[PDB]
Design a protein around this ligand. Structure first.
Ligand SMILES: *[C@@H]1O[C@H](CO)[C@H](O)[C@H](O)[C@H]1O
Ligand SMILES: *[C@@H]1O[C@H](CO)[C@H](O)[C@H](O)[C@H]1O
Lengths: 5, 5
């Protein structure tokens, strides 16, 4: 999965 | 923050 910060 | 699964 991937996350934006 | 938000994550794509
Ligand atoms: C997340 O955003 C970037 C641009 O910041 C890019 O379009 C990636 O493909 C996306 O997953
Ligand atoms: C994550 O992706 C969705 C896809 O429908 C949408 O562009 C949201 O604005 C983005 O944050």
């Amino acid at each position: 999965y991937y996350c934006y910060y």
